[PDB]
Amino acid sequence: AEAWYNLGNAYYKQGDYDEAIEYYQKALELDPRSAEAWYNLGNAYYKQGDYDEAIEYYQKALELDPRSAEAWYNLGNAYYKQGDYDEAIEYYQKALELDPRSAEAWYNLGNAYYKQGDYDEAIEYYQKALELDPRS
Ligand SMILES: [Gd]
Ligand SMILES: [Gd]
Ligand SMILES: [Gd]
User: Fold this and answer.
1) What separation in Å is there between the alpha carbon of 122 and the centre of ligand 3?
2) Distance, CA of 53 to CA of 26 (rounded, Å)
């Protein structure tokens, strides 16, 4: 499994997402235990724009390891990209409960409320983002 996985990683690193998907899937057929491997498969589908696949593989990563702030955040991003703002808010909130440090993540939670037309919360979360990073 480990060898196929590293081949997928090398393809991913040069931007070849369809090859990374082929080799990650071969790795996961031989050993499905690693949360991080499912997460990297989700990321490959996300980069290709196949967001429903990204969601399925992020959810599989989180089933195996629910303490990944990064996995919740990327799950939120995949829902955001489908126009599923209610789900994006839920998963962004779960990510920020595990790790409140990223200005960028608060900002995106603000963006999801803005897209729902809930401007109060958009302002609450934009203000949290700008306290952490006023540069944009
Ligand atoms: Gd390719
Ligand atoms: Gd596609
Ligand atoms: Gd799909």
Assistant:
1) 30
2) 16
Q: Cα-flanking dihedrals φ and ψ of residue 124, to 5°?
A: -55, -45
1-65 has CATH 1.25.40.10 classification: yes
| Residue among 96, 86, 89, 83 at smallest CA distance from 128 | 96
Say how many CA atoms lie within 13 Å of 112 toward its Cβ.
Answer: 25
Query: Domain segments of the chain: what residues?
Result: 1-65, 83-136
Q: Does 83-136 match 1-65 at the fold level?
A: yes
Starting from the CA of residue 55, give the closest ligand. 3
What's the resolution in A?
1.8
Q: Is 43 exposed, middle or buried (0-12, 13-18, 19+ CB in 10 A)?
A: buried
Say how many Å lie between the CA of residue 21 and the centre of ligand 1.
10
Q: Which CATH class is domain 83-136?
A: mainly alpha
- Residue numbers after which the chain breaks, C to N beyond 2.5 angstroms: none
Centroid of ligand 2 to alpha carbon of 48 (angstroms): 6
